[PDB]
Design a protein around this ligand. Structure first.
Ligand SMILES: N=C(N)c1ccc(CNC(=O)[C@@H]2CCCN2C(=O)[C@@H](CC2CCCCC2)NS(=O)(=O)Cc2ccccc2)cc1
Ligand SMILES: *[C@@H]1O[C@H](CO)[C@@H](O)[C@H](O)[C@H]1NC(C)=O
Ligand code: NA
Ligand code: NA
Lengths: 251, 28, 11
């Protein structure tokens, strides 16, 4: 996260770290959506242009974390993966369309002060909140700058941007399964997700029921925090039918 | 599920985090 | 740069 700040303790208890077993290192962010399901970006697991194709046994999920590098004894919990599900129409070839994946844990994780699931949006909450200018929140342990790394989880609040402005900021073909967020050059404030924040959640707090909803997944961006560029996020609601199908079938 | 999105150290105790109001204020 | 995690999780 660029131009963010340290998270408060327990501020994002659905935040998950995807951790490579060997070498031991951060792979991506992710989010907890139930006691046995974790949501992330497909490109965290599968990206052939960079020779990336992780299998279940390659990875661990670390839940309840705050420090990036420390083993947070008595606080974090580490889970193994039973199965990875990548969206069948994830477009790694062109534009990261449908950049979404689910991971089923081998065993349910125990909830605690530090570990708790985020909600997924219904159609109405999505329609109400996914509006230009409305702010969401992104969290992660990724780079502090485009080209270093944080001691603890970082957080930044960013406004959703009008679709034509998103489109006009890039040569990539944008789809309805994406949205973009960030400040404009003339707005003064700044901030963005970055490398390593991949797969983490873009959340909004509903003013109707005071619950946090995951509206997006950190997907892509041209560098980080560049003037005139925006961060792109997988549109979770648009892909929720797939999420539900997977959980209903394999849950 | 039923309890999703309510943080033990914040909503469950009626404590606000330092910047959540920034989100609310944008929901105009 | 990461602290070693308990071996039980790597088995
Ligand atoms: N600025 C952001 N909001 C942001 C930056 C990086 C990410 C992580 N995602 C990625 O790195 C993804 C996966 C492969 C290529 N990629 C990118 O974002 C590419 C743009 C993709 C290319 C493929 C077609 C869709 C657009 N830009 S990129 O500059 O390489 C991302 C990057 C890499 C390393 C350091 C900083 C930034 C996610 C978000
Ligand atoms: C990635 O890994 C799987 C399993 O090993 C393999 O079958 C597949 O062809 C690889 N490439 C994909 C899914 O694009
Ligand atoms: Na364009
Ligand atoms: Na920008």
């Amino acid at each position: 996260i660029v131009e963010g700040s340290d998270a408060e303790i327990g501020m994002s208890p659905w935040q998950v770290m995807l951790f490579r077993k060997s070498p031991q290192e951060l792979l991506c962010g992710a989010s907890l959506i139930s006691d046995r399901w974790v949501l992330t970006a497909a490109h965290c697991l599968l990206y052939p242009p960079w020779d990336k194709n992780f299998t279940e046994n390659d990875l661990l999920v670390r839940i309840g974390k705050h420090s990036r590098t420390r083993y947070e004894r008595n606080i974090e919990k580490i889970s193994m993966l039973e199965k990875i599900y990548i969206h069948p129409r994830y477009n790694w070839r062109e534009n990261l369309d449908r950049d979404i994946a689910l991971m089923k844990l081998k065993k349910p994780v125990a909830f605690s002060d530090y570990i708790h699931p985020v909600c997924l949006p219904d159609r109405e909450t999505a329609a109400s909140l996914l509006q230009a200018g409305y702010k969401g929140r992104v969290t992660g342990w990724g780079n502090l700058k485009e080209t270093g790394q944080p001691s603890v989880l970082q957080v930044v609040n960013l406004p959703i941007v009008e679709r034509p402005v998103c489109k006009d900021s890039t040569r990539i073909r944008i789809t309805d399964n994406m949205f973009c967020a960030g400040y404009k050059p003339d707005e003064g404030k700044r901030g963005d997700a970055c490398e390593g924040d991949s797969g983490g959640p873009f959340v909004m707090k509903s003013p109707f029921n005071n619950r946090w909803y995951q509206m997006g997944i950190v997907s892509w961006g041209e560098g980080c925090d560049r003037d005139g560029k925006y961060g792109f996020y997988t549109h979770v609601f648009r892909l929720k039918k797939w999420i539900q199908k997977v959980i209903d079938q394999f849950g | 599920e039923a309890d999703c999105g309510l943080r033990p150290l914040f909503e469950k105790k009626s404590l606000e985090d330092k910047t959540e109001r920034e989100l609310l204020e944008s929901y105009i | 740069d990461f602290e070693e995690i308990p071996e039980e999780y790597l088995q």
